RNA sequence: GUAUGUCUAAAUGCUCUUAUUUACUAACAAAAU
RNA sequence: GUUCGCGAAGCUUCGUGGACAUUUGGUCAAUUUGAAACAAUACAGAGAUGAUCAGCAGUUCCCCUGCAUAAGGAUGAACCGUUUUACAAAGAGAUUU
């Protein structure tokens, strides 16, 4: 069946929200202008306003990073079934 | 007894604490504070100051407030803040060590981040992975201005300098390697000692080369790469086992 | 998206309110040298010196450790020690290399032991197993000087070579020494035969190099 | 150059699609070479006739 | 919320002076800050230039923001004027210049650059103390014709604060009487020369 | 036709932080500060870049100390940004310098 | 910073004559400048065989040679030069001289022309 | 002044070096030739530097002389050069201090 | 477009010679009435 | 300190209850040991191809200059080497059970 209209809408919303969020994050990251708990204990997170002269994201430094594939589950690669010419 | 011994310290006054760099290179790089356009000069120079701790050690602005970490500058022997220093001025006692033994994994007795990997020269502020209390001493030839001394004498001198600085576990001078291994009880103490004795002369006033101690190159005090010969290894293993046992006891 | 900070009970403090700031890609983790969010908290408002997180959350997860203390999340023991115990009942090998460390960090395997510590099942079992397993003067005749010194103090410069086994204590006072003698492992002034022999041997060893 | 590269890639893909091979990487190079030769021939106005070419 | 603390200029000066011989591990972060500040240095330049004291002005005081690190200093205020008044002032200046030209056999034009490439530009503290800055460009007035304008015409803020002729110290709006306006118009005969 | 949205000018944002504070300053003084600060910035950046052999005059005319070897030259070719900035600074100095001169009895 | 740089920066005290004198004083001490066989890049006009390993270095082949002055000039006031080369394969020092009587070169115990 | 050597020994650079030597004591013992006759060197530091330089030279010589074309005469020549270097080093280890 | 790479343990002043240059670089470009 | 009330001495002074104002700052601590590069000496030394030379790409867990998705870096860096098995079928001869 061609998927339910409501379902489709929901999907759109989810992705739209997510993609929008991502874009916002990206924008924030770009250097041009324009509460929690640990264990049982409750803890307030804050974000301090760093000085606008110092590098915004002092962590990052354009590092090369090789990633592991981490494919634990095994893909089944299934299939079916004159050499002198070819 | 540093508390009732004195309050004051004032090791080297803020008139003359240090000149900033020593001229290698042609031009002075403002951003690194290091001379550029050339590299000729062995660079390591002897400390103008030192920690005579019995005289210096005292109450600080930190002690009152409840500071954990000891003063690097004090250790080096040049804390111009003195009584108004926020870092502690005494040889790390046991109680203090106990108090900061939670944090002592991640950072030194000076409150500064221990690293994951050792520096290739074992040169500074040891790794958090390998706990250690064991200092390589070196450049003892250079630290004594190439003096024809007995190894025994050298060893004695080392003991004198290092015992004062912290509770010793055990010490070894070596003729062949031309070195001085020291081990402490507490890592913090060891660290403090290292900080102190970096770039220090081993000479005394009674020696004839006292006035030209500055012209030499100081002690090269570094971290100890574990001794390979087997008895030592066995001892280490035993110690580790004991530690494990203790941990287990604590757990149950 | 971001995961949460893994800070231990003793790490964080004794109080029912702590305020901390997060600094996204603040510093590089010490293990992995890879950007991550620094949380840093002050414990009690007025108690000096901050407690910044030194490692990335992922790395912490892998080692199963406090992001400040660098100690086991469960048992609060240095990684070596905790791992060592497990081994006694295999340890982690952090690969100290520029590129490889990062890769290791990104892997999500819980390096070595961490899994055991994480699970109530496994940690507890290990503990149980462990429990079961458990259940002037010269001086002559290895142990540390800080113990010797302590002993001396109790009895009331202290040189001791180990290759020699020859501890020349020098109180520099006739009062301290004469108190020390009365209030009381061969201890002269400035199987006995066997001991003597051993001592001699030690001396010889010391003197050949 | 980029265009040429793209063309080469396309040709390789087509050849892959065409028929079965075992250790095809080696053969890819050969194919590329052949293509190059053909191009050269075209440029010259030589007929590019090779007997083994299926 | 609550406005910025009007700091003393002295503090700023001190900060500036500190970051001349900056080469310790102290102010590592200040160097970083300085580096960052290049971003806004052109903005700063634009600001400062915009605030240039006009030839009817000995020395302009100006609002200033500055990074506590000492890395950058923006002139903050944006210089607005009562347009006709401004025009009048300019006209007056022009007239003065013309007069000067008429007078002088040789007019000592500046040499450029004004200070040497070796010589580092004197701190402001060498010539705060110096004598009253010599008189600026404002033409000889008269009580009969230019009766109204003369008192304020050549002031930093062309019309005074706390008056009924301008909005106030924000200096955003102005309303003039007739005779003053007339005077201004008369003054501006050179520049406003319009059909 | 200008921005509908953007109220937030640069200075306002800066003010909103704790790191900036504000004074009232003589314009010549401000200019001098700019010259000095600007100069520092250009030196600092240059030193970071590693090229310590391109020396800045206090007039902002940059030029090399020795004759640079080729590698050094390659390292130390600043581009259209930095040079532009330098030029701007120079211009500022020139206007500021003239005002300084005026203030002083010199002119 | 740019190859066509008009003016190199000088310190504020740079007595040029004095500087020159100083340089001269520290030119006898100097390692380079006080030596022979100063380097040069040159193509080989002779097209010759390296006498050790018979490597046939052809005409116009480029090398980083050493040009040195021969004290014994040709005639009187027109200098002649030794131009050292190495063979590609074996590291034998080939060289040649520029005797300008014939408007050509002379081989100098390196290889043979052919 | 192509090929870098010229640049190095350009007058300005020399002047700079001299200035450095005067104020602070930056010498480049690489840059000057080591003296032939020792005992015209009253300072110790200078002597030490010279010794270091000679050691470096010796090391360099050593590194090259074990190359694969061992039968070539350059290597043989160096063997004597190496010896000379060693001798120089020995001399530098004089017993005045 | 003045290439490049490896290699590195931590005598003093004096003057006199010039109407020049043992000068070096070739990445750059190449025709006649 | 400001102050608005109470209680004692001579509107002046002490003794009190309140209101006002209320937890800054640090990812940092000042010289060698937590990591800047060029330079220098010595030694060699320049892509195909016989040689000389242009430019363009390509791969990468290499970067630099560059505002750069321009452009430029020794053809920017290292690539030029190692290279024996999804390996079976047929025939001939030989020793062991
Ligand atoms: Mg090229
Ligand atoms: Zn201190
Ligand atoms: Zn913790």
From Swiss-Prot, chain A:
Subcellular localization(s) per the UniProt record: Nucleus
Organism: Saccharomyces cerevisiae (strain ATCC 204508 / S288c) (Baker's yeast)
Summary of subunit composition and partner proteins: Belongs to the CWC complex (or CEF1-associated complex), a spliceosome sub-complex reminiscent of a late-stage spliceosome composed of the U2, U5 and U6 snRNAs and at least BUD13, BUD31, BRR2, CDC40, CEF1, CLF1, CUS1, CWC2, CWC15, CWC21, CWC22, CWC23, CWC24, CWC25, CWC27, ECM2, HSH155, IST3, ISY1, LEA1, MSL1, NTC20, PRP8, PRP9, PRP11, PRP19, PRP21, PRP22, PRP45, PRP46, SLU7, SMB1, SMD1, SMD2, SMD3, SMX2, SMX3, SNT309, SNU114, SPP2, SYF1, SYF2, RSE1 and YJU2. Interacts with CLF1, PRP22 and PRP46. Interacts with SPP382.
Note: Present with 1670 molecules/cell in log phase SD medium.
Function: Involved in pre-mRNA splicing. Associated with the spliceosome throughout the splicing reactions, until after the second catalytic step.
Residues annotated as signal peptide: none
Name recorded for this polypeptide: Pre-mRNA-processing protein 45
Protein family (similarity comment): Belongs to the SNW family.
Curated annotation (Swiss-Prot), chain C:
Assembly information from the UniProt record: Belongs to the CWC complex (or CEF1-associated complex), a spliceosome subcomplex composed of the U2, U5 and U6 snRNAs and at least BUD13, BUD31, BRR2, CDC40, CEF1, CLF1, CUS1, CWC2, CWC15, CWC21, CWC22, CWC23, CWC24, CWC25, CWC27, ECM2, HSH155, IST3, ISY1, LEA1, MSL1, NTC20, PRP8, PRP9, PRP11, PRP19, PRP21, PRP22, PRP45, PRP46, SLU7, SMB1, SMD1, SMD2, SMD3, SMX2, SMX3, SNT309, SNU114, SPP2, SYF1, SYF2, RSE1 and YJU2. Interacts with SLU7.
CC per GO annotation: nucleus; Prp19 complex; U2-type catalytic step 1 spliceosome; U2-type catalytic step 2 spliceosome
GO biological process: mRNA splicing, via spliceosome
Lineage of producing organism: Eukaryota, Fungi, Dikarya, Ascomycota, Saccharomycotina
One MF term in the entry's GO annotations: pre-mRNA binding
Protein name as annotated: Pre-mRNA-splicing factor SLT11
Family: Belongs to the SLT11 family.
Role of this protein: Involved in pre-mRNA splicing. Facilitates the cooperative formation of U2/U6 helix II in association with stem II in the spliceosome. Binds to RNA.
Transmembrane segments: none
Cellular compartment(s): Nucleus
Other noteworthy facts: Present with 4260 molecules/cell in log phase SD medium.
Curated annotation (Swiss-Prot), chain F:
Subcellular location: Nucleus
Function field: Functions as a scaffold that mediates the ordered assembly of spliceosomal proteins and snRNAs. Required for association of BRR2 with the spliceosomal U5 snRNP, and the subsequent assembly of the U4/U6-U5 tri-snRNP complex. Functions as a scaffold that positions spliceosomal U2, U5 and U6 snRNAs at splice sites on pre-mRNA substrates, so that splicing can occur. Interacts with both the 5' and the 3' splice site, as well as the branch region. Has a role in branch site-3' splice site selection. Associates with the branch site-3' splice 3'-exon region. Also has a role in cell cycle.
Quaternary context: Component of the U4/U6-U5 tri-snRNP complex composed of the U4, U6 and U5 snRNAs and at least PRP3, PRP4, PRP6, PRP8, PRP18, PRP31, PRP38, SNU13, SNU23, SNU66, SNU114, SPP381, SMB1, SMD1, SMD2, SMD3, SMX2, SMX3, LSM2, LSM3, LSM4, LSM5, LSM6, LSM7, LSM8, BRR2 and DIB1.
More about this protein: Present with 468 molecules/cell in log phase SD medium.
Protein name, per record: Pre-mRNA-splicing factor 8
Swiss-Prot record, chain G:
Disulfide bonds: none
Gene Ontology biological-process annotations: generation of catalytic spliceosome for first transesterification step; generation of catalytic spliceosome for second transesterification step; mRNA splicing, via spliceosome; RNA splicing
UniProtKB keywords: Metal-binding, mRNA processing, mRNA splicing, Nucleus, Spliceosome, Zinc
Tree of life domain: Eukaryota
Induction cue: Expressed in exponential-phase cells grown in rich medium.
Main localization of the protein described in the UniProt heading: nucleus
Any one Gene Ontology cellular component term annotated for this protein: U2-type catalytic step 1 spliceosome
Location(s) in or outside the cell: Nucleus
Sample GO molecular function, one term: U2 snRNA binding
UniProt family annotation: Belongs to the CWC16 family. YJU2 subfamily.
Extra remark: Present with 2250 molecules/cell in log phase SD medium.
Record's function text: Part of the spliceosome which catalyzes two sequential transesterification reactions, first the excision of the non-coding intron from pre-mRNA and then the ligation of the coding exons to form the mature mRNA. Plays a role (via N-terminus) in stabilizing the structure of the spliceosome catalytic core and docking of the branch helix into the active site, producing 5'-exon and lariat intron-3'-intermediates. Further stabilizes spliceosome conformation for 3'-splice site docking (via C-terminus) promoting exon ligation.
Protein name: Splicing factor YJU2
Native source organism of the sequence: Saccharomyces cerevisiae (strain ATCC 204508 / S288c) (Baker's yeast)
Gene: YJU2
Residues of the full protein shown: 2 to 115 of 278
């Amino acid at each position: 069946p061609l998927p339910t209209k409501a379902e489709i809408q929901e999907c759109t919303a989810r992705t739209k929200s997510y993609i929008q969020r991502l874009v916002n994050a990206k924008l924030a990251n770009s250097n041009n202008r324009a509460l929690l708990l640990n264990n049982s204990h409750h803890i307030e997170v804050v974000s301090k306003q760093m000085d606008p002269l110092l590098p915004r994201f002092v962590g990052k430094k354009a590092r090369k990073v090789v990633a592991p594939t981490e494919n634990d589950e095994v893909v089944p690669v299934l299939h079916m079934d004159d050499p002198n010419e070819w | 007894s540093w508390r009732d011994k004195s309050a004051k310290v004032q090791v080297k006054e803020s008139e003359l604490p240090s000149s900033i760099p020593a001229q290698t290179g042609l031009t002075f790089n403002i951003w690194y504070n290091k001379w550029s356009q050339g590299f000729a000069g062995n660079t390591r120079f002897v400390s103008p100051f030192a920690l005579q701790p019995q005289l210096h050690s005292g109450k600080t602005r930190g002690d009152n407030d409840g500071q954990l970490f000891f003063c690097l500058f004090f250790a080096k022997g040049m804390c111009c803040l003195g009584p108004k220093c926020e870092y502690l001025h005494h040889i790390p006692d046991e109680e203090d060590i106990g108090k900061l033994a939670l944090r002592t994994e991640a950072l030194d007795c000076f409150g500064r981040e221990k690293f994951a990997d050792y520096r290739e020269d074992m040169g500074g502020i040891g790794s958090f992975r390998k706990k250690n209390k064991t200092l390589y001493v070196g450049g003892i030839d250079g630290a004594l201005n190439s003096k024809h001394l007995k190894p025994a004498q050298i060893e004695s001198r080392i003991r004198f300098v290092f015992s004062r600085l912290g509770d010793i576990d055990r010490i070894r001078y070596v003729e062949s390697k031309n070195c001085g291994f020291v081990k402490f009880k507490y890592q913090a103490n060891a660290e403090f000692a290292k900080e102190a004795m970096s770039n220090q002369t081993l000479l005394l006033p009674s020696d004839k080369e006292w006035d030209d101690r500055r012209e030499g190159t100081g002690l090269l005090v570094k971290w100890a790469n574990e001794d390979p010969d087997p008895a030592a290894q066995k001892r280490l293993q035993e110690e580790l086992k004991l530690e494990s046992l203790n941990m287990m006891v604590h757990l149950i | 998206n971001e995961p949460p900070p893994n800070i231990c009970e003793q790490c964080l403090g004794d109080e029912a309110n702590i305020r901390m700031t997060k600094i996204p890609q603040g510093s590089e983790c010490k293990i992995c040298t890879l950007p991550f969010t620094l949380y840093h908290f002050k414990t009690s408002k007025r108690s000096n010196n901050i407690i910044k997180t030194l490692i990335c959350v992922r790395c912490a997860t892998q080692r199963n450790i406090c992001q400040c203390c660098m100690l086991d999340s469960r048992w609060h023991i240095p990684i070596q020690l905790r791992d060592h115990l497990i081994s006694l009942v295999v340890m982690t090998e952090e690969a100290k290399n520029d590129m490889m460390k990062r890769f290791l960090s990104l892997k999500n395997v819980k390096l070595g032991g961490a899994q055991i510590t994480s699970d109530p099942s496994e940690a507890d079992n290990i503990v149980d197993k462990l429990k079961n397993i458990l259940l002037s003067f010269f001086l002559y005749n290895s142990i540390p000087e800080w113990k010797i010194t302590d002993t001396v103090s109790q009895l009331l410069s202290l040189i001791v070579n180990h290759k020699a086994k020859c501890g020349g204590l020098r109180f520099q006072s006739s009062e301290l020494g004469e108190r020390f003698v009365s209030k009381i492992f061969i201890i002269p002034w400035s199987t006995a035969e066997n001991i003597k022999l051993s001592l001699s041997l030690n001396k010889l060893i010391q003197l050949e190099l | 150059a980029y265009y040429d590269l793209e063309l080469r890639n396309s040709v390789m893909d087509d050849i892959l699609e065409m028929m079965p091979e075992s250790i095809r990487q080696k053969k890819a190079r050969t194919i590329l070479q052949h293509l190059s030769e053909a191009w050269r021939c075209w440029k010259a106005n030589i007929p590019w006739d090779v007997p083994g070419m299926p | 919320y609550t406005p910025k603390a009007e700091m003393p200029p002295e503090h700023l000066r001190k900060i500036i002076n500190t970051h001349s011989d900056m080469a310790s591990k102290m102010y590592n972060t200040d160097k970083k800050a300085f580096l960052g500040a290049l971003k806004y240095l052109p903005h700063a330049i634009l600001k400062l230039l915009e605030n240039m004291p006009h030839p009817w002005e000995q020395a302009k005081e100006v609002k200033v923001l500055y990074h506590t690190s000492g890395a950058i200093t923006f002139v903050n205020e944006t210089p607005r004027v009562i347009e006709p008044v401004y025009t009048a002032q300019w006209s007056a200046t022009w007239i003065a210049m013309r007069r000067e030209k008429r007078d002088r056999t040789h007019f000592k034009r500046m040499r450029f650059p004004p200070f040497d490439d070796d010589e580092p530009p004197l701190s402001y503290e060498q010539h705060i103390e110096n004598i009253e800055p010599l008189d600026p460009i404002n033409l000889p007035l008269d009580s009969q014709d230019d009766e109204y304008v003369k008192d304020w015409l050549y002031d930093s803020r062309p019309l005074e604060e706390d008056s009924k002729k301008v909005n106030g110290t924000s200096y955003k709006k102005w309303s003039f009487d007739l005779p003053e306006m007339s005077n201004l118009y008369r003054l501006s005969t050179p520049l406003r020369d319009e059909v | 036709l200008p921005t509908n949205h953007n109220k937030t000018k640069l200075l306002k944002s800066l003010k909103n932080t704790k790191y900036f504070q504000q004074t009232t300053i003589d314009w010549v003084e401000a200019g001098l500060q700019l010259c000095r600060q600007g100069h520092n910035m250009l030196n600092l950046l240059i030193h970071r870049k590693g090229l310590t052999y391109l020396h800045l005059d206090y007039n902002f005319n940059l030029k090399p100390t020795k004759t640079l070897t080729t590698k050094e030259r390659k390292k130390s070719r600043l581009g259209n940004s930095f040079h532009l900035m330098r030029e701007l600074l120079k211009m500022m100095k020139l206007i500021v310098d003239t005002h300084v001169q005026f203030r002083l009895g010199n002119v | 910073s740019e190859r066509k740089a008009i003016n190199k920066y000088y310190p504020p005290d740079y007595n040029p004559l004095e500087a020159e004198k100083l340089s001269r004083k520290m030119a006898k001490k100097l390692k380079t400048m006080n030596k022979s066989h100063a380097s040069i890049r040159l193509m080989t006009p002779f097209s010759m065989r390296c006498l050790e390993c018979n490597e046939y270095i052809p005409k116009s082949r480029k090398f980083n040679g050493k040009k040195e002055l021969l004290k014994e000039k040709y005639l009187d006031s027109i200098k002649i030069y030794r131009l050292t080369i190495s063979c590609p394969r074996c590291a034998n020092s080939i060289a040649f001289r520029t005797d300008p009587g014939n408007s050509d070169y002379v081989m100098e115990v390196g290889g043979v022309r052919n | 002044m192509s090929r870098n050597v010229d640049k190095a020994n350009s007058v300005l650079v020399r002047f700079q070096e001299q200035q450095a030597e005067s104020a602070g004591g930056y010498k480049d013992y690489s840059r000057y030739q080591r003296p032939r006759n020792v005992s015209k060197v009253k300072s110790i530091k200078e002597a030490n530097e010279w010794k270091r330089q000679v050691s470096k030279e010796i090391k360099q010589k050593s590194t090259r002389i074990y190359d694969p074309s061992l039968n070539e005469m350059q290597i043989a020549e160096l063997n004597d050069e190496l010896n000379n270097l060693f001798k120089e080093w020995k001399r530098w280890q004089w017993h005045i201090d």
